[PDB]
Automatic annotation (TrEMBL):
<protein>
    <recommendedName>
        <fullName>Thioredoxin</fullName>
    </recommendedName>
</protein>
<feature type="active site" description="Nucleophile">
    <location>
        <position position="34"/>
    </location>
</feature>
<dbReference type="InterPro" id="IPR036249">
    <property type="entry name" value="Thioredoxin-like_sf"/>
</dbReference>
<dbReference type="InterPro" id="IPR017937">
    <property type="entry name" value="Thioredoxin_CS"/>
</dbReference>
<feature type="disulfide bond" description="Redox-active">
    <location>
        <begin position="31"/>
        <end position="34"/>
    </location>
</feature>
<feature type="site" description="Contributes to redox potential value">
    <location>
        <position position="32"/>
    </location>
</feature>
<dbReference type="Pfam" id="PF00085">
    <property type="entry name" value="Thioredoxin"/>
</dbReference>
<feature type="disulfide bond">
    <location>
        <begin position="31"/>
        <end position="34"/>
    </location>
</feature>
<dbReference type="InterPro" id="IPR013766">
    <property type="entry name" value="Thioredoxin_domain"/>
</dbReference>
<dbReference type="InterPro" id="IPR005746">
    <property type="entry name" value="Thioredoxin"/>
</dbReference>
<comment type="similarity">
    <text>Belongs to the thioredoxin family.</text>
</comment>
<feature type="domain" description="Thioredoxin">
    <location>
        <begin position="1"/>
        <end position="104"/>
    </location>
</feature>
<feature type="site" description="Contributes to redox potential value">
    <location>
        <position position="33"/>
    </location>
</feature>
<feature type="active site" description="Nucleophile">
    <location>
        <position position="31"/>
    </location>
</feature>
<feature type="site" description="Deprotonates C-terminal active site Cys">
    <location>
        <position position="25"/>
    </location>
</feature>
<dbReference type="GO" id="GO:0015035">
    <property type="term" value="F:protein-disulfide reductase activity"/>
</dbReference>
<keyword id="KW-1015">Disulfide bond</keyword>
Length: 104
């Protein structure tokens, strides 16, 4: 669960994990669905060590949220070989698992 403080931090994690899927959880502290799904994402991170999981607090790292056109909280963006390969929004556990399966 890498916390990404800047868009540059995101560019770096990407460089250091080229063929590996990265799952970025864009969230807000004040978002109830974000806080609700948070432990699920943490559990998945442990269940699937072959995938890199990161989090962006959209109020703190406004640059990354803007660069990814993130408006809905949570938004999960999936990145592999420096390209965005999928995204969806919502505290939707089944969709999170399916999307991770699809792209790992």
């Amino acid at each position: 669960m890498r916390v990404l403080a800047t868009a540059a931090d995101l560019e770096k994690l990407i460089n250091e994990n080229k063929g590996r899927l990265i799952v970025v959880d864009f969230f807000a502290q004040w978002c109830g669905p974000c806080r609700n799904i948070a432990p699920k994402v943490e559990a998945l991170a442990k269940e699937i060590p072959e995938v890199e999981f990161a989090k962006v607090d959209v109020d703190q790292n406004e640059e990354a949220a803007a660069k990814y056109s993130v408006t809905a909280m949570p938004t999960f963006v999936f990145i592999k070989d420096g390209k965005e390969v999928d995204r969806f929004s919502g505290a939707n556990e089944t969709k999170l698992r399916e999307t991770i399966t699809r792209h790992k």
